[PDB]
Amino acid sequence: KFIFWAAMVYATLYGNYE
Amino acid sequence: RLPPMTFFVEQMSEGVLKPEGWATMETVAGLGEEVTEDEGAESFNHVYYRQMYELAVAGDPWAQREYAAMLRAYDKGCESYRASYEEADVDANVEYGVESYVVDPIDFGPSFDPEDMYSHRHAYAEAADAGVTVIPSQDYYGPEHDDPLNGIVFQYEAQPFSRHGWGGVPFDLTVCCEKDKTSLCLQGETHVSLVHSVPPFGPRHITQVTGSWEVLRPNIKDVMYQLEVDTFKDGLLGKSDHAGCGLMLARLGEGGDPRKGPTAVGVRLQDTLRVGPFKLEACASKVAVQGPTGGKEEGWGARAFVGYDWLPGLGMAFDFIQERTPEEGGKRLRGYGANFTYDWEALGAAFGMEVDYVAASESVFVSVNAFSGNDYRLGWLLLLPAVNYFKETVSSLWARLR
Amino acid sequence: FINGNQLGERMLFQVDQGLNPLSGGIYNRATASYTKFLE
Amino acid sequence: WLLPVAIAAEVLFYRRFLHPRLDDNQRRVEREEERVWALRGQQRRALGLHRPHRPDKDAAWRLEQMYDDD
Amino acid sequence: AVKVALGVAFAFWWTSGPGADEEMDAKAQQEPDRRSQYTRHYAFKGRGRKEFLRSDMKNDANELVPTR
Ligand SMILES: [Mg+2]
């Protein structure tokens, strides 16, 4: 919905750095 | 037996957060000479000295100079500070004799008691410092002829894995304990902060782990565990944009065992943004709690604050919950609210106005408070309730004379 | 407090007297306590 | 019945045991204060200076209610 | 004397508005109270637990000192 996929958009793009 | 899911939704959506950082030893940062405060400089120094230590161990005379100079300032500051401890101890042994210094007793407010009947129990010698702090914890209704305080809250705070004041892992812990022969209350909370990068070595990238536990015997006979992992970074959409994500797990362990019981899983996001003259701070969350026997229950929550340049004194906030109980196709239960505040000064007084809207029951709540530290001109409105009391007195005095 | 560990003595006295001939009664309630911290 | 005997015993216990003890402790406190001001005058007599100019008794009990440092 | 007479005289006219009891029913019909300030608290006993709000957390500074 909104706070499952976009709650993993931030998780994936935080994993994209570290 | 688990708390309602609105409790978790309120707990996971409470604004834009900011984690715990490194604290610096002031005599070795800015070697000898006095300093000032700035977050980026201290964060730079902490990672800079670990880097120079690694390069100095590898060889590299330019790093060895910097690390040796830091070591010199470190030794000088440490010896100065122990000299200050010796001077303070000698001054205390001069000012009092072999006597000690005694704290103030706690003030509990007025009572129908002589108010020094038990004040001699809270005046004690200091001990000065051991690392932890204690406060007493008080209940709402105490016993009649005694002091109301029953429990003790302990607080500890440290930074364990540092090399010479260049710390690693900020850490703190808080435990409330109330023990008697009938009941037992034991609450606890711990936070651990982990720093991955600071500028100019990267962007500011910090994660934080929180754990908490709840024991309350013999009322509940189950214990409560919560764990939160949440990560923040400054950026991701533009320069200096404070974004963060996080997850939360919770359980009600049956008999104390953390392997059995109902569970709660939740995730959250935060962000800030600046478009036009509008600056907004928003956060949102979704919780997927398990019921006692019913199964999945899910909820959505969101908060927003809209800062505004022009009219820089109007505060306005918006809040939303959505509830999804079983039979989800026709039980979507929404709720949203608005809040406005403003602030004036007139007639030698400071006025503040707050307007609140709940939007399910269409009610507007207005609340104005004033404060006049100059005169009693603000009391002219006091004639409003004084008339009606008279109209409720004579009408009583008529009916009491019939 | 001699380096902690207090020494000395302490005495407390309290008297409560009812003055109403009103719903409460005529009473007199007295308490005395005595503590000695001896080496 | 015995209650007036209790009242008379409480008044007698106060007037014969509690009042002189508090009076003696207070008198020791003013003698200690006079020792303080005698030492201050002796210190300023050790130099070639003037007298310390203590305040009067009204100021003494009023400052006893309204100190900032001890 | 004049002021405390004129203020009460205006209060008599302004307080004598029509109806005067339907608004009592409107105010008391919302027996749910005004919404109260949120704090983080424990689930079992409701004692407050500490918060990390950025507008408060950005003012905080700590340091490290040697122990005795
Ligand atoms: Mg407690």
PDB file of N, CA and C in Angstrom, chain D residues 10-52:
ATOM      1  N   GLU D  10       0.879  17.745  79.495  1.00  0.00           N
ATOM      2  CA  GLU D  10       1.521  18.220  78.270  1.00  0.00           C
ATOM      3  C   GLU D  10       2.050  19.643  78.422  1.00  0.00           C
ATOM      4  N   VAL D  11       1.262  20.524  79.048  1.00  0.00           N
ATOM      5  CA  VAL D  11       1.704  21.898  79.288  1.00  0.00           C
ATOM      6  C   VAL D  11       2.897  21.927  80.242  1.00  0.00           C
ATOM      7  N   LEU D  12       2.856  21.116  81.306  1.00  0.00           N
ATOM      8  CA  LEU D  12       3.958  21.057  82.262  1.00  0.00           C
ATOM      9  C   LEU D  12       5.220  20.480  81.632  1.00  0.00           C
ATOM     10  N   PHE D  13       5.071  19.454  80.785  1.00  0.00           N
ATOM     11  CA  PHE D  13       6.219  18.864  80.107  1.00  0.00           C
ATOM     12  C   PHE D  13       6.874  19.857  79.164  1.00  0.00           C
ATOM     13  N   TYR D  14       6.067  20.610  78.408  1.00  0.00           N
ATOM     14  CA  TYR D  14       6.610  21.664  77.554  1.00  0.00           C
ATOM     15  C   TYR D  14       7.332  22.723  78.377  1.00  0.00           C
ATOM     16  N   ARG D  15       6.638  23.304  79.361  1.00  0.00           N
ATOM     17  CA  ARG D  15       7.148  24.454  80.096  1.00  0.00           C
ATOM     18  C   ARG D  15       8.311  24.119  81.015  1.00  0.00           C
ATOM     19  N   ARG D  16       8.533  22.845  81.334  1.00  0.00           N
ATOM     20  CA  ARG D  16       9.662  22.483  82.171  1.00  0.00           C
ATOM     21  C   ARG D  16      10.735  21.678  81.452  1.00  0.00           C
ATOM     22  N   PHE D  17      10.508  21.247  80.214  1.00  0.00           N
ATOM     23  CA  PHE D  17      11.562  20.475  79.573  1.00  0.00           C
ATOM     24  C   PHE D  17      11.943  21.000  78.200  1.00  0.00           C
ATOM     25  N   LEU D  18      10.988  21.501  77.416  1.00  0.00           N
ATOM     26  CA  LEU D  18      11.281  21.802  76.024  1.00  0.00           C
ATOM     27  C   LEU D  18      11.727  23.242  75.816  1.00  0.00           C
ATOM     28  N   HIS D  19      11.150  24.187  76.555  1.00  0.00           N
ATOM     29  CA  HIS D  19      11.525  25.593  76.397  1.00  0.00           C
ATOM     30  C   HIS D  19      12.968  25.926  76.800  1.00  0.00           C
ATOM     31  N   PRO D  20      13.511  25.494  77.962  1.00  0.00           N
ATOM     32  CA  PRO D  20      14.909  25.859  78.261  1.00  0.00           C
ATOM     33  C   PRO D  20      15.938  25.220  77.345  1.00  0.00           C
ATOM     34  N   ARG D  21      15.655  24.042  76.789  1.00  0.00           N
ATOM     35  CA  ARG D  21      16.601  23.394  75.884  1.00  0.00           C
ATOM     36  C   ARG D  21      16.745  24.171  74.577  1.00  0.00           C
ATOM     37  N   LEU D  22      15.618  24.593  74.001  1.00  0.00           N
ATOM     38  CA  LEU D  22      15.650  25.417  72.798  1.00  0.00           C
ATOM     39  C   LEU D  22      16.246  26.791  73.068  1.00  0.00           C
ATOM     40  N   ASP D  23      15.966  27.361  74.247  1.00  0.00           N
ATOM     41  CA  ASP D  23      16.561  28.646  74.605  1.00  0.00           C
ATOM     42  C   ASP D  23      18.080  28.548  74.734  1.00  0.00           C
ATOM     43  N   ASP D  24      18.570  27.457  75.331  1.00  0.00           N
ATOM     44  CA  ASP D  24      20.008  27.246  75.476  1.00  0.00           C
ATOM     45  C   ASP D  24      20.693  27.083  74.120  1.00  0.00           C
ATOM     46  N   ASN D  25      20.069  26.323  73.210  1.00  0.00           N
ATOM     47  CA  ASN D  25      20.648  26.136  71.879  1.00  0.00           C
ATOM     48  C   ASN D  25      20.683  27.440  71.090  1.00  0.00           C
ATOM     49  N   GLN D  26      19.618  28.242  71.193  1.00  0.00           N
ATOM     50  CA  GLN D  26      19.608  29.529  70.509  1.00  0.00           C
ATOM     51  C   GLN D  26      20.671  30.468  71.065  1.00  0.00           C
ATOM     52  N   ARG D  27      20.840  30.499  72.396  1.00  0.00           N
ATOM     53  CA  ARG D  27      21.854  31.356  73.016  1.00  0.00           C
ATOM     54  C   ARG D  27      23.267  30.973  72.586  1.00  0.00           C
ATOM     55  N   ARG D  28      23.525  29.668  72.433  1.00  0.00           N
ATOM     56  CA  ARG D  28      24.793  29.229  71.851  1.00  0.00           C
ATOM     57  C   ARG D  28      24.965  29.738  70.422  1.00  0.00           C
ATOM     58  N   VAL D  29      23.867  29.807  69.659  1.00  0.00           N
ATOM     59  CA  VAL D  29      23.958  30.327  68.291  1.00  0.00           C
ATOM     60  C   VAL D  29      24.326  31.819  68.272  1.00  0.00           C
ATOM     61  N   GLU D  30      23.714  32.653  69.144  1.00  0.00           N
ATOM     62  CA  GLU D  30      24.148  34.064  69.104  1.00  0.00           C
ATOM     63  C   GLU D  30      25.561  34.262  69.645  1.00  0.00           C
ATOM     64  N   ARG D  31      26.011  33.432  70.590  1.00  0.00           N
ATOM     65  CA  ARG D  31      27.396  33.574  71.041  1.00  0.00           C
ATOM     66  C   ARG D  31      28.390  33.198  69.943  1.00  0.00           C
ATOM     67  N   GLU D  32      28.050  32.193  69.127  1.00  0.00           N
ATOM     68  CA  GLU D  32      28.866  31.853  67.960  1.00  0.00           C
ATOM     69  C   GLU D  32      28.899  32.992  66.935  1.00  0.00           C
ATOM     70  N   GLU D  33      27.765  33.671  66.731  1.00  0.00           N
ATOM     71  CA  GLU D  33      27.735  34.812  65.809  1.00  0.00           C
ATOM     72  C   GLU D  33      28.589  35.980  66.313  1.00  0.00           C
ATOM     73  N   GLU D  34      28.557  36.232  67.623  1.00  0.00           N
ATOM     74  CA  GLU D  34      29.396  37.282  68.192  1.00  0.00           C
ATOM     75  C   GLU D  34      30.879  36.937  68.100  1.00  0.00           C
ATOM     76  N   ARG D  35      31.220  35.647  68.212  1.00  0.00           N
ATOM     77  CA  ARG D  35      32.593  35.204  67.970  1.00  0.00           C
ATOM     78  C   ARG D  35      33.030  35.479  66.532  1.00  0.00           C
ATOM     79  N   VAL D  36      32.123  35.260  65.569  1.00  0.00           N
ATOM     80  CA  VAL D  36      32.405  35.554  64.159  1.00  0.00           C
ATOM     81  C   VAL D  36      32.738  37.033  63.964  1.00  0.00           C
ATOM     82  N   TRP D  37      31.919  37.916  64.539  1.00  0.00           N
ATOM     83  CA  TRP D  37      32.160  39.344  64.319  1.00  0.00           C
ATOM     84  C   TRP D  37      33.381  39.854  65.086  1.00  0.00           C
ATOM     85  N   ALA D  38      33.703  39.239  66.230  1.00  0.00           N
ATOM     86  CA  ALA D  38      34.944  39.567  66.929  1.00  0.00           C
ATOM     87  C   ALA D  38      36.171  39.180  66.110  1.00  0.00           C
ATOM     88  N   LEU D  39      36.135  38.008  65.462  1.00  0.00           N
ATOM     89  CA  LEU D  39      37.241  37.603  64.591  1.00  0.00           C
ATOM     90  C   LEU D  39      37.388  38.522  63.383  1.00  0.00           C
ATOM     91  N   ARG D  40      36.270  38.971  62.804  1.00  0.00           N
ATOM     92  CA  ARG D  40      36.356  39.891  61.667  1.00  0.00           C
ATOM     93  C   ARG D  40      36.956  41.236  62.072  1.00  0.00           C
ATOM     94  N   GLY D  41      36.569  41.747  63.245  1.00  0.00           N
ATOM     95  CA  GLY D  41      37.175  42.973  63.745  1.00  0.00           C
ATOM     96  C   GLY D  41      38.653  42.818  64.056  1.00  0.00           C
ATOM     97  N   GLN D  42      39.047  41.644  64.559  1.00  0.00           N
ATOM     98  CA  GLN D  42      40.461  41.370  64.811  1.00  0.00           C
ATOM     99  C   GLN D  42      41.264  41.308  63.515  1.00  0.00           C
ATOM    100  N   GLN D  43      40.678  40.723  62.463  1.00  0.00           N
ATOM    101  CA  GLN D  43      41.340  40.670  61.160  1.00  0.00           C
ATOM    102  C   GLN D  43      41.544  42.055  60.578  1.00  0.00           C
ATOM    103  N   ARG D  44      40.538  42.916  60.676  1.00  0.00           N
ATOM    104  CA  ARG D  44      40.739  44.262  60.158  1.00  0.00           C
ATOM    105  C   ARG D  44      41.557  45.142  61.091  1.00  0.00           C
ATOM    106  N   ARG D  45      41.753  44.726  62.342  1.00  0.00           N
ATOM    107  CA  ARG D  45      42.700  45.400  63.220  1.00  0.00           C
ATOM    108  C   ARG D  45      44.132  44.962  62.953  1.00  0.00           C
ATOM    109  N   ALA D  46      44.319  43.775  62.364  1.00  0.00           N
ATOM    110  CA  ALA D  46      45.662  43.314  62.016  1.00  0.00           C
ATOM    111  C   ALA D  46      46.278  44.149  60.900  1.00  0.00           C
ATOM    112  N   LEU D  47      45.462  44.644  59.977  1.00  0.00           N
ATOM    113  CA  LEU D  47      45.883  45.666  59.028  1.00  0.00           C
ATOM    114  C   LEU D  47      45.703  47.042  59.669  1.00  0.00           C
ATOM    115  N   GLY D  48      45.700  48.084  58.851  1.00  0.00           N
ATOM    116  CA  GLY D  48      45.374  49.402  59.351  1.00  0.00           C
ATOM    117  C   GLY D  48      44.025  49.875  58.859  1.00  0.00           C
ATOM    118  N   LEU D  49      43.053  48.970  58.804  1.00  0.00           N
ATOM    119  CA  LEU D  49      41.772  49.257  58.183  1.00  0.00           C
ATOM    120  C   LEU D  49      40.726  49.632  59.227  1.00  0.00           C
ATOM    121  N   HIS D  50      39.487  49.757  58.775  1.00  0.00           N
ATOM    122  CA  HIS D  50      38.362  50.183  59.587  1.00  0.00           C
ATOM    123  C   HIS D  50      37.556  48.962  60.030  1.00  0.00           C
ATOM    124  N   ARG D  51      36.428  49.196  60.688  1.00  0.00           N
ATOM    125  CA  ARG D  51      35.619  48.143  61.283  1.00  0.00           C
ATOM    126  C   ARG D  51      34.645  47.555  60.256  1.00  0.00           C
ATOM    127  N   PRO D  52      34.271  46.272  60.399  1.00  0.00           N
ATOM    128  CA  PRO D  52      33.537  45.584  59.320  1.00  0.00           C
ATOM    129  C   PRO D  52      32.104  46.054  59.076  1.00  0.00           C
TER     130      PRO D  52
END
